[PDB]
Amino acid sequence: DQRNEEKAQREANKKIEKQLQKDKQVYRATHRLLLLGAGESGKNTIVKTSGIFETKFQVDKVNFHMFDVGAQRDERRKWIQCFNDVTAIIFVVASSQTNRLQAALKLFDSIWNNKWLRDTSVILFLNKQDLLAEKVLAGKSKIEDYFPEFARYTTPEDATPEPGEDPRVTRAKYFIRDEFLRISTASGDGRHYCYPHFTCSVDTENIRRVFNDCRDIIQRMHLRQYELL
Amino acid sequence: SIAQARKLVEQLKMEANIDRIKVSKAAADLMAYCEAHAKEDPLLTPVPASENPF
Amino acid sequence: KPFLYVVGRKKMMDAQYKCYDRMQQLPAYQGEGPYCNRTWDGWLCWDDTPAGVLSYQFCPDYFPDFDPSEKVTKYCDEKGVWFKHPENNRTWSNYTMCNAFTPEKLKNAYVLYYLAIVGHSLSIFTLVISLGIFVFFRSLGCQRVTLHKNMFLTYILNSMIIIIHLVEVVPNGELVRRDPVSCKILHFFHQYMMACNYFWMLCEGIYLHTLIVVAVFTEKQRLRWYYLLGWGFPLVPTTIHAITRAVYFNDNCWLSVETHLLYIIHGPVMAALVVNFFFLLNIVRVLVTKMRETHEAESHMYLKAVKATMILVPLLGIQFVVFPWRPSNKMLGKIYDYVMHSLIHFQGFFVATIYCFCNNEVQTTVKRQ
Amino acid sequence: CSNLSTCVLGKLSQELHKLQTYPRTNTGSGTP
Amino acid sequence: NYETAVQFCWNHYKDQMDPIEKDWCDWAMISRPYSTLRDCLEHFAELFDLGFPNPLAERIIFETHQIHFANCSLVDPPEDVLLAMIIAPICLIPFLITLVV
Amino acid sequence: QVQLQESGGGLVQPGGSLRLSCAASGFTFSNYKMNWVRQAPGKGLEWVSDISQSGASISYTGSVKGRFTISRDNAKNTLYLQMNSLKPEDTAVYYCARCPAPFTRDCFDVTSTTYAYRGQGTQVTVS
Amino acid sequence: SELDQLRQEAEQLKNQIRDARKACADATLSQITNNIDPVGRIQMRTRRTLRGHLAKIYAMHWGTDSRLLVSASQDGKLIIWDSYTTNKVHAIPLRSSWVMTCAYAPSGNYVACGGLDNICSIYNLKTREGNVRVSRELAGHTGYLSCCRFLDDNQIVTSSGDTTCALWDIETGQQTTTFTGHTGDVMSLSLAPDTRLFVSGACDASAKLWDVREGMCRQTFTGHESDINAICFFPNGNAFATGSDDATCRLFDLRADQELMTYSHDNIICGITSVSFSKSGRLLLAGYDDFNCNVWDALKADRAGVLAGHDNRVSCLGVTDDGMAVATGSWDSFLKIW
Ligand SMILES: CC(C)CCC[C@@H](C)[C@H]1CC[C@H]2[C@@H]3CC=C4C[C@@H](OC(=O)CCC(=O)O)CC[C@]4(C)[C@H]3CC[C@]12C
Ligand SMILES: CC(C)CCC[C@@H](C)[C@H]1CC[C@H]2[C@@H]3CC=C4C[C@@H](OC(=O)CCC(=O)O)CC[C@]4(C)[C@H]3CC[C@]12C
Ligand SMILES: CCCCCCCCCCCCCCCC(=O)O
Ligand SMILES: CCCCCCCCCCCCCCCC(=O)O
Ligand SMILES: CCCCCCCCCCCCCCCC(=O)O
Ligand SMILES: CCCCCCCCCCCCCCCC(=O)O
Ligand SMILES: CCCCCCCCCCCCCCCC(=O)O
Ligand SMILES: *[C@@H]1O[C@H](CO)[C@@H](O)[C@H](O)[C@H]1NC(C)=O
Return the CATH fold of G2-337: Methylamine Dehydrogenase; Chain H (2.130.10)
Resolution of this entry, Å: 3.0
* Pocket-testing residue among C111, C167, C342, C343, ligand 3, by greatest number of atoms within 8 A of Cβ: C111
Q: Ligand 3, atom 11: nearest CA belongs to which residue?
A: C114
Distance (Å, rounded) from C-alpha C211 to C-alpha C147? 13
Distance (Å, rounded) from C-alpha G155 to C-alpha G103? 12
Distance (Å, rounded) from C-alpha C258 to C-alpha C256? 6
State whether G247 and F1 contact (CB < 8 Å). Answer: no
D residues 1-32 lying closer than 8 A (beta carbon) to E: 29-32
Which of D18, D26, D29, D31 best tests the C interface by mutation, with the highest count of C CBs <10 A? Answer: D18
Lateral strand order in the sheet of F78-84: F3-7, F17-25, F78-84, F68-73
Other beta carbons less than 10 A from residue C224's beta carbon:
10
Short-list A183, A214, A14, CA closest to A104: A183
Return the CATH fold of E2-75: DNA polymerase; domain 1 (1.10.150)
Radius of gyration of chain A (CA): 21
CATH number among 3.40.50.300, 3.40.190.10, 3.40.47.10, 3.40.605.10, domain A35-225: 3.40.50.300
Q: Ligand 5, atom 5: nearest CA belongs to which residue?
A: C186
* Pocket-testing residue among C273, C279, C281, ligand 7, by greatest number of atoms within 8 A of Cβ: C281
Q: Are A127 and A160 in contact (CB under 8 A)?
A: no
Q: Ligand 4, atom 4: nearest CA belongs to which residue?
A: C121
Gaps in chain C (C–N > 2.5 Å) come after which residues? Answer: none
F50, containing H or E segment: strand F45-51
Distance (Å, rounded) from C-alpha A174 to C-alpha A156? 8
Phi first, then psi, for residue G303 (nearest 5°) are -65, 125
Burial of C26 (C-beta count, 10 Å sphere; 0-12/13-18/19+): exposed
Lateral strand order in the sheet of G110-115: G99-104, G110-115, G120-124, G134-138
Residues within a 6 A CB radius of ligand 1: C 146, 150, 153, 157, 189, 192-193, 227, 231
Q: Are G278 and B40 in contact (CB under 8 A)?
A: no
**Whole-angstrom distance between the N-terminal and C-terminal Cα of chain D?**
31
Radius of gyration of chain C (CA): 27
Distance from CA of C251 to the nearest CA of A (A): 44
Cβ within 8 Å of residue G262, ≥6 positions away: G223, G248, G249, G250, G301
Distance (Å, rounded) from C-alpha A64 to C-alpha A67? 10
The full set of domain ranges for chain E reads: 2-75
C338 lines ligand 3 (CB under 6 A): no
Distance (Å, rounded) from C-alpha F95 to C-alpha A146? 20
Going by the DSSP 8-state scheme, the letter that residue C354 receives in this structure is: I
A residues 85-114 lying closer than 8 A (beta carbon) to F: 97-99, 102-103, 106, 109-111, 113-114
What number of helices (H) and strands (E) belong to chain B?
2, 0
Map out the domains of chain C with their CATH numbers. 3-99 (4.10.1240.10), 102-368 (1.20.1070.10)
Candidate from F43, F106, F114 with C-beta closest to A97: F43
Taking each helix axis from N to C terminus, what angle separates C3-25 and E55-67, rounded to the nearest 10 degrees?
Answer: 70
Do F and E share at least 3 CB pairs under 8 Å? no
Q: Are A130 and A200 in contact (CB under 8 A)?
A: yes
Return the bridge partners of A63, or none: A58
Q: With contacts defined as CB-CB under 8 Å, which chain C residues touch A197?
A: none
DSSP H helical ranges for A97-163: 100-112, 129-137
Which of G53, G292, G311 best tests the C interface by mutation, with the highest count of C CBs <10 A? Answer: G311
Return the bridge partners of G110, or none: G124
Q: Nearest ligand to the C-alpha of residue C97?
A: 8
What residue type is B21 in one-letter code?
I
The domain in which residue B53 lies consists of: 1-54
Distance (Å, rounded) from C-alpha G88 to C-alpha G54? 14
Q: What share of chain B is helix, strand, coil (3-state, %, to 5)?
A: 50, 0, 50
Q: Ligand 1, atom 7: nearest CA belongs to which residue?
A: C231
Going by the DSSP 8-state scheme, the letter that residue C229 receives in this structure is: I
Q: What's the domain count of chain F?
A: 1
CA distances in angstroms from C308 to A229, C301, C322, G59, G221, listed in the order given: 7, 10, 16, 40, 55
Q: Are G56 and G315 in contact (CB under 8 A)?
A: yes
CA distances in angstroms from C364 to C140, C359, F38, G293, listed in the order given: 10, 9, 45, 18
Going by the DSSP 8-state scheme, the letter that residue F13 receives in this structure is: -
D11-14, Cβ contacts within 8 angstroms, sequence gap of 24 or more: D11/C257, D11/C326, D12/C109, D12/C112, D12/C113, D12/C116, D12/C341, D13/C165, D13/C166, D13/C170, D13/C255, D13/C257, D14/C255, D14/C256, D14/C257, D14/C258
Candidate from C142, C290, C361 with C-beta closest to A219: C290
Taking each helix axis from N to C terminus, what angle separates B4-16 and G2-24, rounded to the nearest 10 degrees?
Answer: 20
Q: Nearest ligand to the C-alpha of residue C284?
A: 7
Cβ within 8 Å of residue G269, ≥6 positions away: F102, F103, G247
Phi first, then psi, for residue E97 (nearest 5°) are -55, -40
What residue type is C19 in one-letter code?
C
Q: Taking CA E24 as the corner, what is the angle to CA E23 and CA E25, rounded to the nearest 5 degrees? A: 90
Return the bridge partners of A90, or none: A35, A123
* Pocket-testing residue among C158, C221, C228, C231, ligand 2, by greatest number of atoms within 8 A of Cβ: C231
The full set of domain ranges for chain G reads: 2-337
Q: Ligand 1, atom 26: nearest CA belongs to which residue?
A: C146
G residues 38-57 lying closer than 8 A (beta carbon) to B: 39, 42, 44, 47-48
Determined by cryo-EM
The domain in which residue F52 lies consists of: 3-126
